[PDB]
Amino acid sequence: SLLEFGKMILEETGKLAIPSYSSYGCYCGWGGKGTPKDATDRCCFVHDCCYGNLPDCNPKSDRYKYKRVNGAIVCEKGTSCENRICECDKAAAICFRQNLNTYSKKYMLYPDFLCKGELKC
Ligand SMILES: CN1c2ccccc2[C@]23C[C@H]4[C@H]([C@@H]5C[C@H](O)N4[C@@H](C5)[C@H]12)[C@H]3O
Ligand SMILES: COc1ccc(C(=O)O)cc1
């Protein structure tokens, strides 16, 4: 769930989940539409897509167990859905870190109205 996703995002990137990634570009937080702004907005595009492969669970709400360990992130014996959600998030959190440089405060709190168009997963 978001409570787990947020801890992850903080743990890996050092930045707090909320202002730092909850409205970034066109796909972080909101989702919806548009051509992703940059590397970090693109992660969100994949993460959405990641949650999309699952219509059988509640990504935003179902709580899962994961632990850290000298660096990497480990998801644990859950309920398929629970496990699947964790790898989705795990990836996404890794992607943010992977691209912590292209992080631009210019896109932090990027509205919506300027986000235009289709994009198939
Ligand atoms: C409308 N809703 C949908 C309705 C029917 C099928 C798929 C979707 C969503 C789910 C998910 C994703 C982006 C980001 C956002 O989290 N959601 C929106 C747009 C779409 C997009 O795939
Ligand atoms: C992919 O990054 C996010 C960040 C915030 C939210 C949200 O606030 O719903 C969803 C996905």
Side-chain angles (χ1 to χ4, degrees):
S1 78
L2 265 16
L3 181 69
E4 282 75 44
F5 188 37
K7 186 157 169 283
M8 214 175 285
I9 293 22
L10 171 79
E11 292 182 308
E12 286 293 341
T13 66
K15 302 180 149 312
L16 293 190
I18 273 164
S20 291
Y21 293 94
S22 88
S23 73
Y24 201 104
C26 294
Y27 283 104
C28 289
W30 328 85
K33 35 71 144 66
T35 298
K37 290 296 94 129
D38 59 37
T40 316
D41 194 342
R42 232 132 36 179
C43 299
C44 280
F45 183 76
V46 190
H47 178 263
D48 271 301
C49 283
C50 202
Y51 280 7
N53 267 335
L54 317 175
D56 40 80
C57 342
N58 311 286
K60 280 190 174 195
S61 107
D62 195 3
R63 298 181 71 190
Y64 59 78
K65 289 257 195 294
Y66 83 82
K67 80 155 187 178
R68 253 263 202 161
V69 166
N70 301 61
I73 286 166
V74 170
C75 301
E76 281 145 344
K77 202 188 179 47
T79 68
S80 99
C81 265
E82 289 186 341
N83 251 335
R84 323 207 63 205
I85 279 162
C86 183
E87 292 303 330
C88 271
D89 289 358
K90 185 216 215 172
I94 285 299
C95 190
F96 289 144
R97 189 177 109 285
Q98 202 194 145
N99 289 287
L100 253 162
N101 280 296
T102 94
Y103 188 80
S104 79
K105 309 182 93 289
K106 93 108 86 60
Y107 284 123
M108 210 173 55
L109 302 144
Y110 196 84
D112 147 51
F113 32 100
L114 217 269
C115 291
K116 31 209 154 219
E118 113 155 37
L119 271 202
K120 300 190 180 180
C121 284

PDB file of all heavy atoms in Angstrom, residues 22-50:
ATOM      1  N   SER A  22       4.832  12.778  -5.377  1.00  0.00           N
ATOM      2  CA  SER A  22       3.402  12.540  -5.512  1.00  0.00           C
ATOM      3  C   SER A  22       2.673  13.361  -6.550  1.00  0.00           C
ATOM      4  O   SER A  22       1.479  13.164  -6.774  1.00  0.00           O
ATOM      5  CB  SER A  22       2.710  12.668  -4.150  1.00  0.00           C
ATOM      6  OG  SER A  22       2.314  14.000  -3.870  1.00  0.00           O
ATOM      7  N   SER A  23       3.376  14.282  -7.192  1.00  0.00           N
ATOM      8  CA  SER A  23       2.729  15.062  -8.234  1.00  0.00           C
ATOM      9  C   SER A  23       3.691  15.376  -9.373  1.00  0.00           C
ATOM     10  O   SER A  23       3.281  15.982 -10.371  1.00  0.00           O
ATOM     11  CB  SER A  23       2.146  16.355  -7.672  1.00  0.00           C
ATOM     12  OG  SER A  23       3.172  17.276  -7.368  1.00  0.00           O
ATOM     13  N   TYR A  24       4.952  14.945  -9.214  1.00  0.00           N
ATOM     14  CA  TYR A  24       6.032  15.133 -10.201  1.00  0.00           C
ATOM     15  C   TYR A  24       5.528  14.874 -11.609  1.00  0.00           C
ATOM     16  O   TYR A  24       4.737  13.953 -11.826  1.00  0.00           O
ATOM     17  CB  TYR A  24       7.182  14.164  -9.913  1.00  0.00           C
ATOM     18  CG  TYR A  24       8.543  14.546 -10.493  1.00  0.00           C
ATOM     19  CD1 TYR A  24       9.542  15.065  -9.667  1.00  0.00           C
ATOM     20  CD2 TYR A  24       8.848  14.358 -11.843  1.00  0.00           C
ATOM     21  CE1 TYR A  24      10.810  15.388 -10.163  1.00  0.00           C
ATOM     22  CE2 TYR A  24      10.126  14.672 -12.348  1.00  0.00           C
ATOM     23  CZ  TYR A  24      11.102  15.191 -11.494  1.00  0.00           C
ATOM     24  OH  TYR A  24      12.368  15.516 -11.952  1.00  0.00           O
ATOM     25  N   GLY A  25       5.989  15.687 -12.557  1.00  0.00           N
ATOM     26  CA  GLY A  25       5.576  15.532 -13.940  1.00  0.00           C
ATOM     27  C   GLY A  25       4.127  15.129 -14.180  1.00  0.00           C
ATOM     28  O   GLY A  25       3.219  15.479 -13.416  1.00  0.00           O
ATOM     29  N   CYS A  26       3.920  14.363 -15.245  1.00  0.00           N
ATOM     30  CA  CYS A  26       2.587  13.916 -15.643  1.00  0.00           C
ATOM     31  C   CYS A  26       2.109  12.574 -15.101  1.00  0.00           C
ATOM     32  O   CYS A  26       0.902  12.334 -15.045  1.00  0.00           O
ATOM     33  CB  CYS A  26       2.481  13.855 -17.182  1.00  0.00           C
ATOM     34  SG  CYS A  26       2.577  15.457 -18.039  1.00  0.00           S
ATOM     35  N   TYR A  27       3.033  11.700 -14.709  1.00  0.00           N
ATOM     36  CA  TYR A  27       2.629  10.374 -14.262  1.00  0.00           C
ATOM     37  C   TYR A  27       2.795   9.960 -12.798  1.00  0.00           C
ATOM     38  O   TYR A  27       2.171   8.994 -12.352  1.00  0.00           O
ATOM     39  CB  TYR A  27       3.226   9.334 -15.214  1.00  0.00           C
ATOM     40  CG  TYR A  27       2.450   9.273 -16.524  1.00  0.00           C
ATOM     41  CD1 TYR A  27       2.955   9.839 -17.702  1.00  0.00           C
ATOM     42  CD2 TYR A  27       1.187   8.687 -16.573  1.00  0.00           C
ATOM     43  CE1 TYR A  27       2.220   9.819 -18.887  1.00  0.00           C
ATOM     44  CE2 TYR A  27       0.446   8.667 -17.756  1.00  0.00           C
ATOM     45  CZ  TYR A  27       0.968   9.233 -18.907  1.00  0.00           C
ATOM     46  OH  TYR A  27       0.235   9.202 -20.070  1.00  0.00           O
ATOM     47  N   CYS A  28       3.602  10.696 -12.045  1.00  0.00           N
ATOM     48  CA  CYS A  28       3.770  10.431 -10.625  1.00  0.00           C
ATOM     49  C   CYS A  28       2.542  10.895  -9.831  1.00  0.00           C
ATOM     50  O   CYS A  28       2.140  12.068  -9.908  1.00  0.00           O
ATOM     51  CB  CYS A  28       4.992  11.173 -10.101  1.00  0.00           C
ATOM     52  SG  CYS A  28       6.544  10.484 -10.698  1.00  0.00           S
ATOM     53  N   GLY A  29       1.952   9.976  -9.070  1.00  0.00           N
ATOM     54  CA  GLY A  29       0.803  10.309  -8.245  1.00  0.00           C
ATOM     55  C   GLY A  29      -0.539  10.270  -8.915  1.00  0.00           C
ATOM     56  O   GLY A  29      -1.403   9.449  -8.597  1.00  0.00           O
ATOM     57  N   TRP A  30      -0.675  11.204  -9.849  1.00  0.00           N
ATOM     58  CA  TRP A  30      -1.881  11.422 -10.634  1.00  0.00           C
ATOM     59  C   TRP A  30      -2.096  10.307 -11.665  1.00  0.00           C
ATOM     60  O   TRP A  30      -3.089   9.569 -11.635  1.00  0.00           O
ATOM     61  CB  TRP A  30      -1.811  12.733 -11.488  1.00  0.00           C
ATOM     62  CG  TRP A  30      -1.022  13.944 -10.973  1.00  0.00           C
ATOM     63  CD1 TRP A  30       0.345  14.184 -11.103  1.00  0.00           C
ATOM     64  CD2 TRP A  30      -1.572  15.121 -10.368  1.00  0.00           C
ATOM     65  NE1 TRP A  30       0.661  15.445 -10.615  1.00  0.00           N
ATOM     66  CE2 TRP A  30      -0.492  16.037 -10.156  1.00  0.00           C
ATOM     67  CE3 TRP A  30      -2.870  15.498  -9.991  1.00  0.00           C
ATOM     68  CZ2 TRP A  30      -0.686  17.303  -9.570  1.00  0.00           C
ATOM     69  CZ3 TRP A  30      -3.064  16.756  -9.409  1.00  0.00           C
ATOM     70  CH2 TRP A  30      -1.974  17.644  -9.202  1.00  0.00           C
ATOM     71  N   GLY A  31      -1.136  10.233 -12.586  1.00  0.00           N
ATOM     72  CA  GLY A  31      -1.156   9.276 -13.666  1.00  0.00           C
ATOM     73  C   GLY A  31      -1.860   9.956 -14.807  1.00  0.00           C
ATOM     74  O   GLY A  31      -1.429  10.995 -15.305  1.00  0.00           O
ATOM     75  N   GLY A  32      -2.966   9.364 -15.217  1.00  0.00           N
ATOM     76  CA  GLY A  32      -3.737   9.939 -16.284  1.00  0.00           C
ATOM     77  C   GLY A  32      -3.105  10.008 -17.655  1.00  0.00           C
ATOM     78  O   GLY A  32      -2.967   8.996 -18.349  1.00  0.00           O
ATOM     79  N   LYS A  33      -2.661  11.209 -18.009  1.00  0.00           N
ATOM     80  CA  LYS A  33      -2.191  11.457 -19.350  1.00  0.00           C
ATOM     81  C   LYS A  33      -0.926  12.222 -19.630  1.00  0.00           C
ATOM     82  O   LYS A  33      -0.384  12.913 -18.771  1.00  0.00           O
ATOM     83  CB  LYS A  33      -3.327  12.170 -20.085  1.00  0.00           C
ATOM     84  CG  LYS A  33      -4.158  13.149 -19.207  1.00  0.00           C
ATOM     85  CD  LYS A  33      -3.396  14.412 -18.811  1.00  0.00           C
ATOM     86  CE  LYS A  33      -4.311  15.644 -18.787  1.00  0.00           C
ATOM     87  NZ  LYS A  33      -5.362  15.604 -17.722  1.00  0.00           N
ATOM     88  N   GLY A  34      -0.481  12.091 -20.877  1.00  0.00           N
ATOM     89  CA  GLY A  34       0.664  12.844 -21.340  1.00  0.00           C
ATOM     90  C   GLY A  34       1.935  12.140 -21.730  1.00  0.00           C
ATOM     91  O   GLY A  34       2.072  10.926 -21.591  1.00  0.00           O
ATOM     92  N   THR A  35       2.864  12.927 -22.253  1.00  0.00           N
ATOM     93  CA  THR A  35       4.160  12.413 -22.632  1.00  0.00           C
ATOM     94  C   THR A  35       5.019  12.702 -21.406  1.00  0.00           C
ATOM     95  O   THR A  35       5.164  13.850 -20.996  1.00  0.00           O
ATOM     96  CB  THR A  35       4.699  13.145 -23.877  1.00  0.00           C
ATOM     97  OG1 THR A  35       3.813  12.909 -24.983  1.00  0.00           O
ATOM     98  CG2 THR A  35       6.114  12.665 -24.227  1.00  0.00           C
ATOM     99  N   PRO A  36       5.558  11.650 -20.771  1.00  0.00           N
ATOM    100  CA  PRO A  36       6.400  11.798 -19.580  1.00  0.00           C
ATOM    101  C   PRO A  36       7.490  12.835 -19.783  1.00  0.00           C
ATOM    102  O   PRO A  36       8.202  12.808 -20.790  1.00  0.00           O
ATOM    103  CB  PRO A  36       6.976  10.398 -19.385  1.00  0.00           C
ATOM    104  CG  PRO A  36       5.890   9.519 -19.867  1.00  0.00           C
ATOM    105  CD  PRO A  36       5.379  10.227 -21.110  1.00  0.00           C
ATOM    106  N   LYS A  37       7.614  13.724 -18.799  1.00  0.00           N
ATOM    107  CA  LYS A  37       8.584  14.818 -18.791  1.00  0.00           C
ATOM    108  C   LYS A  37      10.060  14.454 -18.783  1.00  0.00           C
ATOM    109  O   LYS A  37      10.859  15.070 -19.490  1.00  0.00           O
ATOM    110  CB  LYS A  37       8.332  15.727 -17.596  1.00  0.00           C
ATOM    111  CG  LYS A  37       7.078  16.552 -17.689  1.00  0.00           C
ATOM    112  CD  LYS A  37       7.127  17.533 -18.847  1.00  0.00           C
ATOM    113  CE  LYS A  37       6.488  16.957 -20.088  1.00  0.00           C
ATOM    114  NZ  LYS A  37       5.495  17.925 -20.631  1.00  0.00           N
ATOM    115  N   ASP A  38      10.435  13.493 -17.950  1.00  0.00           N
ATOM    116  CA  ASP A  38      11.826  13.099 -17.887  1.00  0.00           C
ATOM    117  C   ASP A  38      12.015  11.684 -17.356  1.00  0.00           C
ATOM    118  O   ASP A  38      11.050  10.922 -17.254  1.00  0.00           O
ATOM    119  CB  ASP A  38      12.644  14.114 -17.066  1.00  0.00           C
ATOM    120  CG  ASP A  38      12.150  14.274 -15.634  1.00  0.00           C
ATOM    121  OD1 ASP A  38      11.726  13.266 -15.028  1.00  0.00           O
ATOM    122  OD2 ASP A  38      12.216  15.409 -15.107  1.00  0.00           O
ATOM    123  N   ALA A  39      13.256  11.329 -17.029  1.00  0.00           N
ATOM    124  CA  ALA A  39      13.551   9.984 -16.548  1.00  0.00           C
ATOM    125  C   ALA A  39      12.694   9.595 -15.339  1.00  0.00           C
ATOM    126  O   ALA A  39      12.025   8.555 -15.348  1.00  0.00           O
ATOM    127  CB  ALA A  39      15.030   9.867 -16.232  1.00  0.00           C
ATOM    128  N   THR A  40      12.707  10.446 -14.315  1.00  0.00           N
ATOM    129  CA  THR A  40      11.911  10.228 -13.111  1.00  0.00           C
ATOM    130  C   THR A  40      10.384  10.182 -13.374  1.00  0.00           C
ATOM    131  O   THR A  40       9.670   9.476 -12.675  1.00  0.00           O
ATOM    132  CB  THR A  40      12.177  11.328 -12.081  1.00  0.00           C
ATOM    133  OG1 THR A  40      13.584  11.579 -12.011  1.00  0.00           O
ATOM    134  CG2 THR A  40      11.671  10.909 -10.717  1.00  0.00           C
ATOM    135  N   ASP A  41       9.878  10.932 -14.354  1.00  0.00           N
ATOM    136  CA  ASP A  41       8.437  10.916 -14.672  1.00  0.00           C
ATOM    137  C   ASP A  41       8.134   9.616 -15.426  1.00  0.00           C
ATOM    138  O   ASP A  41       7.000   9.125 -15.448  1.00  0.00           O
ATOM    139  CB  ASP A  41       8.096  12.119 -15.578  1.00  0.00           C
ATOM    140  CG  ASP A  41       6.573  12.415 -15.699  1.00  0.00           C
ATOM    141  OD1 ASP A  41       5.707  11.557 -15.390  1.00  0.00           O
ATOM    142  OD2 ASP A  41       6.248  13.546 -16.140  1.00  0.00           O
ATOM    143  N   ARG A  42       9.168   9.060 -16.047  1.00  0.00           N
ATOM    144  CA  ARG A  42       8.997   7.866 -16.850  1.00  0.00           C
ATOM    145  C   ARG A  42       8.854   6.635 -15.984  1.00  0.00           C
ATOM    146  O   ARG A  42       8.166   5.685 -16.373  1.00  0.00           O
ATOM    147  CB  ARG A  42      10.168   7.739 -17.836  1.00  0.00           C
ATOM    148  CG  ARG A  42       9.746   7.539 -19.313  1.00  0.00           C
ATOM    149  CD  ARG A  42      10.476   8.478 -20.299  1.00  0.00           C
ATOM    150  NE  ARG A  42      11.864   8.723 -19.916  1.00  0.00           N
ATOM    151  CZ  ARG A  42      12.723   9.473 -20.601  1.00  0.00           C
ATOM    152  NH1 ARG A  42      12.350  10.065 -21.730  1.00  0.00           N
ATOM    153  NH2 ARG A  42      13.955   9.645 -20.140  1.00  0.00           N
ATOM    154  N   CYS A  43       9.486   6.675 -14.804  1.00  0.00           N
ATOM    155  CA  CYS A  43       9.445   5.578 -13.828  1.00  0.00           C
ATOM    156  C   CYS A  43       7.998   5.434 -13.435  1.00  0.00           C
ATOM    157  O   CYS A  43       7.423   4.345 -13.484  1.00  0.00           O
ATOM    158  CB  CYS A  43      10.238   5.918 -12.575  1.00  0.00           C
ATOM    159  SG  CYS A  43      12.030   6.268 -12.702  1.00  0.00           S
ATOM    160  N   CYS A  44       7.426   6.559 -13.022  1.00  0.00           N
ATOM    161  CA  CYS A  44       6.021   6.615 -12.660  1.00  0.00           C
ATOM    162  C   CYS A  44       5.169   6.037 -13.796  1.00  0.00           C
ATOM    163  O   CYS A  44       4.189   5.331 -13.540  1.00  0.00           O
ATOM    164  CB  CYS A  44       5.619   8.061 -12.346  1.00  0.00           C
ATOM    165  SG  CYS A  44       6.156   8.493 -10.669  1.00  0.00           S
ATOM    166  N   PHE A  45       5.541   6.321 -15.044  1.00  0.00           N
ATOM    167  CA  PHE A  45       4.792   5.771 -16.165  1.00  0.00           C
ATOM    168  C   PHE A  45       4.842   4.244 -16.091  1.00  0.00           C
ATOM    169  O   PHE A  45       3.818   3.579 -16.251  1.00  0.00           O
ATOM    170  CB  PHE A  45       5.353   6.231 -17.527  1.00  0.00           C
ATOM    171  CG  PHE A  45       4.548   5.716 -18.703  1.00  0.00           C
ATOM    172  CD1 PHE A  45       3.320   6.283 -19.035  1.00  0.00           C
ATOM    173  CD2 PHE A  45       4.989   4.624 -19.441  1.00  0.00           C
ATOM    174  CE1 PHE A  45       2.535   5.742 -20.057  1.00  0.00           C
ATOM    175  CE2 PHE A  45       4.204   4.079 -20.464  1.00  0.00           C
ATOM    176  CZ  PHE A  45       2.988   4.644 -20.777  1.00  0.00           C
ATOM    177  N   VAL A  46       6.020   3.676 -15.848  1.00  0.00           N
ATOM    178  CA  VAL A  46       6.116   2.221 -15.772  1.00  0.00           C
ATOM    179  C   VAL A  46       5.380   1.667 -14.546  1.00  0.00           C
ATOM    180  O   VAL A  46       4.654   0.677 -14.650  1.00  0.00           O
ATOM    181  CB  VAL A  46       7.576   1.761 -15.753  1.00  0.00           C
ATOM    182  CG1 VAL A  46       7.650   0.250 -15.916  1.00  0.00           C
ATOM    183  CG2 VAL A  46       8.332   2.452 -16.864  1.00  0.00           C
ATOM    184  N   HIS A  47       5.561   2.313 -13.396  1.00  0.00           N
ATOM    185  CA  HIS A  47       4.904   1.895 -12.166  1.00  0.00           C
ATOM    186  C   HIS A  47       3.391   1.833 -12.373  1.00  0.00           C
ATOM    187  O   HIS A  47       2.743   0.874 -11.942  1.00  0.00           O
ATOM    188  CB  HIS A  47       5.269   2.860 -11.027  1.00  0.00           C
ATOM    189  CG  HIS A  47       4.604   2.561  -9.715  1.00  0.00           C
ATOM    190  ND1 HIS A  47       3.462   3.210  -9.299  1.00  0.00           N
ATOM    191  CD2 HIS A  47       4.948   1.726  -8.705  1.00  0.00           C
ATOM    192  CE1 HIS A  47       3.136   2.795  -8.090  1.00  0.00           C
ATOM    193  NE2 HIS A  47       4.022   1.892  -7.707  1.00  0.00           N
ATOM    194  N   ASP A  48       2.820   2.839 -13.038  1.00  0.00           N
ATOM    195  CA  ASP A  48       1.367   2.849 -13.285  1.00  0.00           C
ATOM    196  C   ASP A  48       1.040   1.590 -14.054  1.00  0.00           C
ATOM    197  O   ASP A  48       0.170   0.790 -13.687  1.00  0.00           O
ATOM    198  CB  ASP A  48       0.963   4.069 -14.119  1.00  0.00           C
ATOM    199  CG  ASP A  48       0.650   5.271 -13.272  1.00  0.00           C
ATOM    200  OD1 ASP A  48      -0.264   5.181 -12.425  1.00  0.00           O
ATOM    201  OD2 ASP A  48       1.316   6.306 -13.451  1.00  0.00           O
ATOM    202  N   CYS A  49       1.771   1.454 -15.144  1.00  0.00           N
ATOM    203  CA  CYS A  49       1.665   0.322 -16.006  1.00  0.00           C
ATOM    204  C   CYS A  49       1.798  -0.933 -15.154  1.00  0.00           C
ATOM    205  O   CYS A  49       1.050  -1.890 -15.322  1.00  0.00           O
ATOM    206  CB  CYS A  49       2.776   0.416 -17.058  1.00  0.00           C
ATOM    207  SG  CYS A  49       2.367   1.631 -18.346  1.00  0.00           S
ATOM    208  N   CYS A  50       2.735  -0.910 -14.212  1.00  0.00           N
ATOM    209  CA  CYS A  50       2.954  -2.064 -13.358  1.00  0.00           C
ATOM    210  C   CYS A  50       1.703  -2.405 -12.566  1.00  0.00           C
ATOM    211  O   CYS A  50       1.327  -3.572 -12.458  1.00  0.00           O
ATOM    212  CB  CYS A  50       4.121  -1.819 -12.420  1.00  0.00           C
ATOM    213  SG  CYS A  50       4.849  -3.358 -11.813  1.00  0.00           S
TER     214      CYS A  50
END
